[PDB]
Design a binder for this molecule. Structure first.
Ligand SMILES: O=C(NC[C@@H]1O[C@H](CO)[C@H](O)[C@H](n2cc(-c3cc(F)c(F)c(F)c3)nn2)[C@H]1O)c1ccc(F)c2ccccc12
Ligand SMILES: [Cl-]
Ligand SMILES: [Cl-]
Ligand SMILES: [Cl-]
Length: 138
């Protein structure tokens, strides 16, 4: 019910206490999903489930500055399943983005991009049916 890739404007950027909620369903034969919190052409926070990286499922997080990817942060907890509905919650906290999937804490990602108020778009892409994408202040 939303078209992927989908752009969600974040007006005035992000700020601590801002909660972003993404609902959708992973496609049957999924390979990849990405959420990109963007500051212009930079990617402040890339959140990238890979369903088949050398026959392993991994989430890769990173930042893109001046077209260059930095040091990846990985982990092995992988809550997504092909064919199944998911909820991703991204809570902006003072020193990191905090991600929970299906109401279970997954990971945190320390802020590398410091101008939070310039992180003004969220891109959602890859092998999903996207139901909804929104934000609220908690
Ligand atoms: O391409 C690999 N790595 C290089 C780069 O790593 C970055 C993070 O450090 C971004 O994820 C880069 N990236 C990812 C995307 C992307 C685009 C989309 F439209 C999506 F829907 C999506 F989910 C992801 N765009 N840029 C990626 O190309 C990669 C290397 C070795 C392996 F073995 C891989 C196995 C499966 C998938 C990817 C690989
Ligand atoms: Cl910055
Ligand atoms: Cl700021
Ligand atoms: Cl896409």
């Amino acid at each position: 019910m939303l078209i992927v890739p989908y752009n969600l404007p974040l007006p005035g950027g992000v700020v601590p206490r801002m909660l972003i909620t993404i609902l959708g369903t992973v496609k049957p034969n999924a390979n990849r999903i990405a959420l990109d919190f963007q500051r212009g052409n930079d990617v402040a926070f890339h959140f990238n489930p890979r369903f088949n990286e050398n026959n392993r499922r991994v989430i890769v997080c990173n930042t893109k500055l001046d077209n260059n990817w930095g040091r990846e942060e990985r982990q092995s907890v992988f809550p997504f399943e092909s064919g199944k509905p998911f909820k991703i919650q991204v809570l902006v906290e003072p020193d990191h983005f905090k991600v929970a999937v299906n109401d279970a804490h997954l990971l945190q990602y320390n802020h590398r991009v410091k101008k939070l108020n310039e992180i003004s778009k969220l891109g959602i892409s890859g092998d999903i049916d996207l139901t909804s994408a929104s934000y609220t202040m908690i």
